[PDB]
Design a protein around this ligand. Structure first.
Ligand SMILES: *[C@@H]1O[C@H](CO)[C@@H](O[C@@H]2O[C@H](CO)[C@@H](O)[C@H](O)[C@H]2NC(C)=O)[C@H](O)[C@H]1NC(C)=O
Ligand SMILES: *[C@@H]1O[C@H](CO)[C@@H](O[C@@H]2O[C@H](CO)[C@@H](O)[C@H](O)[C@H]2NC(C)=O)[C@H](O)[C@H]1NC(C)=O
Ligand SMILES: *[C@@H]1O[C@H](CO)[C@@H](O[C@@H]2O[C@H](CO)[C@@H](O)[C@H](O)[C@H]2NC(C)=O)[C@H](O)[C@H]1NC(C)=O
Ligand SMILES: *[C@@H]1O[C@H](CO)[C@@H](O[C@@H]2O[C@H](CO)[C@@H](O)[C@H](O)[C@H]2NC(C)=O)[C@H](O)[C@H]1NC(C)=O
Ligand SMILES: *[C@@H]1O[C@H](CO)[C@@H](O[C@@H]2O[C@H](CO)[C@@H](O)[C@H](O)[C@H]2NC(C)=O)[C@H](O)[C@H]1NC(C)=O
Ligand SMILES: *[C@@H]1O[C@H](CO)[C@@H](O)[C@H](O)[C@H]1NC(C)=O
Ligand SMILES: *[C@@H]1O[C@H](CO)[C@@H](O)[C@H](O)[C@H]1NC(C)=O
Ligand SMILES: *[C@@H]1O[C@H](CO)[C@@H](O)[C@H](O)[C@H]1NC(C)=O
Ligand SMILES: *[C@@H]1O[C@H](CO)[C@@H](O)[C@H](O)[C@H]1NC(C)=O
Ligand SMILES: *[C@@H]1O[C@H](CO)[C@@H](O)[C@H](O)[C@H]1NC(C)=O
Ligand SMILES: *[C@@H]1O[C@H](CO)[C@@H](O)[C@H](O)[C@H]1NC(C)=O
Ligand SMILES: *[C@@H]1O[C@H](CO)[C@@H](O)[C@H](O)[C@H]1NC(C)=O
Ligand SMILES: *[C@@H]1O[C@H](CO)[C@@H](O)[C@H](O)[C@H]1NC(C)=O
Ligand SMILES: *[C@@H]1O[C@H](CO)[C@@H](O)[C@H](O)[C@H]1NC(C)=O
Lengths: 427, 392, 231, 147, 49
């Protein structure tokens, strides 16, 4: 019908990809912590601060030398797209059944007494069997048994002072209620699955950091300079238009944001250049039309957009050639509501037919096209005022007018149970 | 203050002088028209979420329909108050109104706009400094020294639409109402304008409240001086550092406070791992990502729904004050009202409208009785076996 | 020995740019209008604890103060730190020695045995915040000039960090070292942090202009719950 | 138009409420019998609880909008009730309350879901210029008109 | 009756809000202390939400 409508976005575009990453060359120790011989014990687990890598992950979990690859905060697929800014590899060797006791929020004898993960944890658990390596009856693998309290996560304890469970201060004597804290593993090759030694590695990191370093095999590309992309800057991604910036950052401000905690300005990790981001949908498009029963002509209003920047903002070249008709032409008019394209602006004045905004209306006029004018308030008049003159009427008119008012509306009623789930007793 | 009235069965008090009093009444008429893009607010430029949002039905055509209804109603509010007459009357060039001086309310032929002095004093009392989002959108349109600045897509889908009648057309309407009232009386609101001299019209406005018409002609210079002094006091009170337009400022404060909350609610994670969509997109696989994305979708839908419901309840009470201002324009300005305290305090003589930002201001001219005197009174008088009662 | 510090102890807790906003954050600051101990070691440089973190600030004349040590066992039993200067560039050595009972530098007693790593890089004031979290050790600084001789000003200053140290070790106490002319071998202000809640102001170009402490008085609690400066 | 827009809105709301039943809100399907036939009530209780909240939200949105529409209709029933007392049962002096002009009388006519008033007013026409004076002096005294 | 209708509506609207506290909405209990004394802080965050 005749009016002005606000259309949701339906035009589609093709999109490319940009990657940016620092200059980093060297590898880092993943070739030795996975096939070593001297692994540490459970109560005294190893810790290795890792930095400055291009270290791949597909070389690890695609190699089938592992039996369990449980990976918590990140999906196991896209571990080679992100930076990690520190990696903590830890090593210890346990029984076969206690590989479940490594998970966040567990119990038993490892998660409460030997090694405890935090509940807010983002890493990746690796475990596989070592029956042909640490089984002779090998007694060199030890594990802590008792403590007075529970283990706070990510902390270690090494001490030989014996237990106390009564009130006798047992000074290194193994009687009742006072026992030694450390006992040996029984690793014979004549046991089933759940008793052989297992090599258990765990990793640990945190993401969304500014000067992040540890990131793997992602090839840098070049910028494409104001087109819609899917960029990737040291791990953080997003879709938008990469624009040139002017913001006075500091020696270290890796990225910026606004009130809504969304990023809008990013730093180039190669050229040390600042890139301002801006989304690309442009939903603010309104369509002036008469009825489709009358014609098939339209006009288009671009909301709060200057007229010379219309084909850059709606991405005109990547559209249909019918949509490029409504992007530049002879019918280009600049209003205070935006840029109106498709209507023939005149110098007359009428009363309003279709309101556009800020004093401008539009109508379908007879060669029949759509015109745009400035609306007229009414006829001009002047009263012949003098200080001794009056006007008296001499005739009259009886007039009958009409006034319509709504009084009542329809009385509906809704059955709740039949609407939500009709005649189903499970619901 | 405590008081006591000297009542007795044969005593009356009668005023001997009067006072012409001019007072002020401020009414909100319209509010800000907004518009929200659903898809850009909930998940902007992300096709993984836009296909998840379709599973929630039509929960966004409904919100856009509600907000469009509000924004359309805000123009009907202004049209029903100001567009009362459809003949643009011009003010007369030579001004001899019997001593009355309408200089500070008639439009100013120096400036290029149509505002008067009092309308200029009123347009600077309402500010937009403490408003969060509306000032941040209002700096788009003055940011002329920046090419490639499309800022509809910079505020997470939130926009502000401009009013249909600009600030010059509204002042051009109020000047037509003033020029009709001064040179024609009440006759232009009931047919065609019929001229009458101003003192001869003030005489019938005295005659309408129960004072005979020789009192005006015998105290005309005093009444004109009282009117001009009462206008000068209004201009002095407005020009000072008073916070006079509180009722028009509370509308802008309430409208900005509710738009800052809709942006501040975009940083809550609602139980997900992160409040940022691209981190969930680049840290999880689409089997296990559409639980966190569903949590964010549910929370942001709830925030939008709460905003739209409070906007509907808030616009339903701007509609009421627009109906009240449209009744006061018809009965106080285009006529003379006999209802008590509808137009001012006292006995009503006439009213003049002035336009304010998102509102209207009425200047009610009333008649207040002054210093009185005790007398003795009686119901009737007996002369020849007959009772005589007074006519008026 | 107690002194009032008004608005000192402010820094940039994050590496994100914010222009013309009013952001709130919950971090470890020194509370406003607090008590700092007045130290002047003319007739000792004793050991002071490390409870949450340490604010350090001094008014120096000709670079008398060299550096600090951080640790508690002090006989190479467990780890400790050492930051000094060789009057050209700063030196950062996290290595174990045996520490004296009158330790300073001479215009001198170190003997390391087993350590992890090392790193090298009235006119004006040298403010310093020492914060030890799990996995790091950050060195914030404010280097401002003032005309007052001994005391803290009423001004507001907060400027950019210097260096973070990936140590992951424990600190309980600390101590500072001076520059004496003689090399013996014989046997400035401090203030501790607290978990407050602060509202900060960013102007254009992302500079911290003023801050509000949301626990000092009911009027600042009102300013905090209104998310504004004016009430 | 005003009596037609009421019917249009109150049918559009009940059509949106019916079309909202075809969404699944994250469940595997929108038909409850197809969820119940393919799953046992360990894991049907998550799909059914996903549908129940999504349908309660639609019902609550419907009722909340109907309350505001009824509050708007009440305010015009209260205006028609005042126009019936003051325009029909009397003769009003309030300007432009009972039609443009000077009011004489009014007649009501019933309509579907509403009411229609026919206001009879007096409108002057065919003017003429004259010359006027406030008073007239006769014997030193001033004379003013009665009406 | 008009002055009593307002009281009768406000008291009912305040009673319904109190009676809605004895619902579980799909958890195991309508009591927070039962979920906090019977279950672990990794698990109780899905019966509290
Ligand atoms: C009463 O007298 C005035 C003044 O003579 C009339 O106003 C004039 O109307 C004519 C009509 O075309 C105009 O051309 C003149 O410009 C008007 N004069 C002024 C000063 O405005 C007025 O029309 C007369 N009234 C009637 C009913 O005829
Ligand atoms: C007042 O107006 C009425 C009509 O509105 C005039 O009646 C008209 O008179 C002429 C001349 O006889 C006729 O040609 C018309 O047909 C009449 N119309 C009607 C409806 O009767 C009446 O004459 C006018 N009075 C004056 C004094 O001018
Ligand atoms: C009625 O009141 C007016 C003022 O409201 C009086 O006019 C004042 O008269 C005094 C004395 O002549 C002057 O000093 C004032 O300047 C006058 N004021 C104005 C505004 O003119 C008037 O005298 C009073 N009349 C009676 C009979 O009491
Ligand atoms: C109506 O009142 C105004 C306000 O006092 C008068 O305007 C001033 O008049 C003086 C007298 O010459 C001028 O010096 C000022 O410049 C005027 N002010 C402005 C803003 O114009 C005005 O003169 C009065 N009207 C009449 C007819 O005297
Ligand atoms: C980290 O440092 C704290 C603070 O010194 C240590 O807590 C101390 O532990 C020792 C060992 O039993 C006690 O003698 C002290 O009394 C403790 N001090 C306080 C204030 O509690 C903590 O144990 C250290 N953690 C380690 C070394 O892992
Ligand atoms: C990193 O590599 C790019 C491309 O060769 C170069 O422009 C830039 O200067 C390099 N930066 C450093 C610090 O080596
Ligand atoms: C680890 O060592 C084994 C030797 O048995 C070798 O086959 C394997 O390739 C090594 N792994 C890596 C990653 O170098
Ligand atoms: C369309 O317009 C034609 C006039 O050409 C009229 O006959 C017809 O009824 C209209 N149809 C609609 C649906 O408005
Ligand atoms: C739109 O761009 C043109 C091109 O320079 C400029 O002349 C015009 O002033 C711009 N519009 C506005 C409102 O600034
Ligand atoms: C219409 O107005 C424009 C500017 O307002 C002017 O340039 C043009 O010549 C006018 N055209 C006509 C036909 O009056
Ligand atoms: C009228 O008389 C009473 C008592 O005689 C007195 O209190 C009152 O003030 C008088 N009224 C006036 C207006 O003076
Ligand atoms: C600071 O010291 C003063 C005395 O020097 C004492 O009165 C006060 O309680 C102390 N604490 C503060 C201000 O928190
Ligand atoms: C460091 O080496 C010393 C030998 O000088 C040794 O006594 C000490 O235990 C070692 N510390 C370790 C390995 O942590
Ligand atoms: C902030 O930027 C402006 C330029 O917009 C500059 O004039 C001003 O000096 C800057 N403030 C600083 C550097 O403190």
């Amino acid at each position: 019908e005749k009016g002005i409508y606000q259309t949701s976005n339906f035009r589609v575009q093709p999109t490319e990809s940009i990657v940016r990453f620092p200059n980093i060359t060297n590898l880092c120790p993943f070739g030795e912590v996975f096939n070593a011989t001297r692994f540490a014990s459970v109560y005294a687990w190893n810790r290795k601060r890792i930095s400055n890598c291009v270290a791949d992950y597909s070389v690890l979990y695609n190699s089938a030398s592992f039996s369990t690859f449980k990976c918590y905060g990140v999906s196991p697929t896209k571990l080679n797209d992100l930076c990690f800014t520190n990696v903590y590899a830890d090593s210890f060797v346990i029984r076969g059944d206690e590989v479940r006791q490594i998970a966040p929020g567990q119990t038993g004898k490892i998660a409460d007494y030997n090694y405890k993960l935090p509940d807010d944890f983002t890493g990746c658990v690796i475990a596989w069997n070592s029956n042909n390596l640490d089984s002779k009856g090998n007694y060199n693998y030890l594990y802590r048994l008792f403590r007075k309290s529970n283990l706070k996560p990510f902390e270690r304890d090494i001490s030989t002072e014996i237990y106390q469970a009564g009130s006798t201060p047992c000074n290194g004597v193994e009687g009742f209620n006072c026992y030694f804290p450390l006992q040996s593993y029984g690793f014979q090759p004549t046991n089933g699955v759940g008793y052989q030694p297992y090599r258990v590695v765990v990793l640990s990191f945190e993401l969304l950091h500014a000067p992040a370093t540890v990131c793997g095999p992602k090839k840098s590309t070049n910028l494409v300079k104001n087109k819609c992309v899917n960029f990737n800057f040291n791990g953080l991604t997003g879709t938008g238009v990469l624009t040139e910036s002017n913001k006075k950052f500091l020696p270290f401000q890796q990225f910026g944001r606004d009130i809504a905690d969304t990023t809008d300005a990013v730093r180039d990790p190669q050229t040390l250049e600042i890139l301002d981001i801006t989304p690309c949908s442009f939903g603010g498009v309104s369509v002036i039309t008469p009825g489709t029963n009358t014609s098939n002509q339209v006009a288009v209003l671009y909301q709060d957009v200057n007229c010379t920047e219309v084909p850059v903002a709606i991405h005109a070249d990547q559209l249909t050639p019918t949509w490029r008709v409504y992007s530049t032409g002879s019918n280009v008019f600049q209003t205070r509501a935006g840029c109106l394209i498709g209507a023939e602006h005149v110098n007359n004045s009428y009363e309003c037919d279709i309101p556009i905004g800020a004093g401008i209306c539009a109508s379908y006029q007879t060669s029949q096209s759509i015109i745009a004018y400035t609306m007229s308030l009414g006829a001009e008049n002047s009263v012949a005022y003098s200080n001794n003159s009056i006007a008296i009427p001499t005739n009259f008119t009886i007039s009958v007018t009409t006034e319509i008012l709504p009084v009542s509306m329809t009385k509906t009623s809704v059955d709740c149970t039949m609407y939500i789930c009709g005649d189903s007793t499970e619901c | 203050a405590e008081n006591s009235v000297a009542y007795s069965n044969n005593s009356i008090a009668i005023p001997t002088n009067f006072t012409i009093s001019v007072t002020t009444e401020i009414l909100p008429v319209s509010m800000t028209k907004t518009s929200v893009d659903c898809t850009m607010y909930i998940c902007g430029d992300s096709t993984e979420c836009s296909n998840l949002l379709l599973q929630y039905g039509s929960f966004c055509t409904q919100l856009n329909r509600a907000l469009t209804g509000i924004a359309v109603e805000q123009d009907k509010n202004t049209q029903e108050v100001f567009a009362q007459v459809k003949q643009i009357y011009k003010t007369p060039p030579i001004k001899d109104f019997g001593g009355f001086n309408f200089s500070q309310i008639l439009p100013d032929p120096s400036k290029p706009s149509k505002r008067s002095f009092i309308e200029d004093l009123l347009f600077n009392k309402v500010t937009l400094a403490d408003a969060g989002f509306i000032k941040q959108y209002g700096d788009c349109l003055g940011d002329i020294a920046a090419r490639d600045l499309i800022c509809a897509q910079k505020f997470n889908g939130l926009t502000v639409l401009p009013p249909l009648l600009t600030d010059e057309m509204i002042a051009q309407y109020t000047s037509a109402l003033l020029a009709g009232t001064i040179t024609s009386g009440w006759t232009f609101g009931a047919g065609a304008a019929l001229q009458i001299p101003f003192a001869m019209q003030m005489a019938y406005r005295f005659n309408g409240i129960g004072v005979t018409q020789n009192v005006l002609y015998e105290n005309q210079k005093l009444i004109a001086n009282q009117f001009n002094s009462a206008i000068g006091k209004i201009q002095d009170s407005l020009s000072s550092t008073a916070s006079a337009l509180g009722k028009l400022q509370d509308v802008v404060n309430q409208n900005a406070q509710a738009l800052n909350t809709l942006v501040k609610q975009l940083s809550s994670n609602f139980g997900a791992i992160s409040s940022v969509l691209n981190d969930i997109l680049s840290r999880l696989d689409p089997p296990e990502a559409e639980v966190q994305i569903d949590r964010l979708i549910t929370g942001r839908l709830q925030s939008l729904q709460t905003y739209v419901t409070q906007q509907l309840i808030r616009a339903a009470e701007i509609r009421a004050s627009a109906n009240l201002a449209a009744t006061k324009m018809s009965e106080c300005v285009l006529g003379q009202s006999k209802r008590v305290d509808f137009c001012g305090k006292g006995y009503h003589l006439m009213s003049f409208p002035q336009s304010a930002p998102h509102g209207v201001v009425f200047l009610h001219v009333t008649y207040v009785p002054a210093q009185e005197k005790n007398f003795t009174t009686a119901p009737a008088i007996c002369h020849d076996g007959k009772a005589h009662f007074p006519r008026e | 020995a107690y002194t009032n510090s008004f608005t000192r102890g402010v820094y940039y807790p994050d590496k994100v740019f914010r222009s013309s906003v009013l952001h709130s954050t919950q971090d470890l600051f020194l509370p406003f209008f607090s008590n700092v101990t007045w130290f002047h070691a003319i007739h000792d440089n004793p050991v002071l604890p490390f409870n949450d973190g340490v604010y350090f600030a001094s008014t120096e004349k000709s670079n008398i103060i060299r550096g600090w040590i951080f640790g508690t066992t002090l006989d190479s039993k467990t780890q400790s730190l050492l930051i000094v200067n060789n009057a050209t560039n700063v030196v950062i050595k996290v290595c174990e020695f045996q520490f004296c009972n009158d330790p300073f530098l001479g215009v001198v007693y170190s003997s390391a045995n087993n350590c992890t790593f090392e790193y090298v890089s009235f006119k004006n004031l040298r403010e310093f915040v020492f914060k030890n979290i799990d996995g790091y050790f950050k060195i914030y600084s404010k280097h401002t000039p003032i005309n007052l001789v001994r005391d803290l000003p009423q001004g507001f200053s907060a400027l950019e960090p210097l260096v973070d140290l990936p140590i992951g070790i424990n600190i309980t106490r600390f101590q500072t070292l001076l520059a004496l002319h003689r090399s013996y071998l014989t046997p400035y202000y401090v203030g501790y942090l607290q978990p407050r809640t602060f509202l900060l102001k960013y102007n254009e170009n992302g500079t911290i202009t003023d801050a509000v402490d949301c626990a000092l008085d009911p009027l600042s609690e009102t300013k905090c719950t209104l998310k504004s400066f004016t009430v």
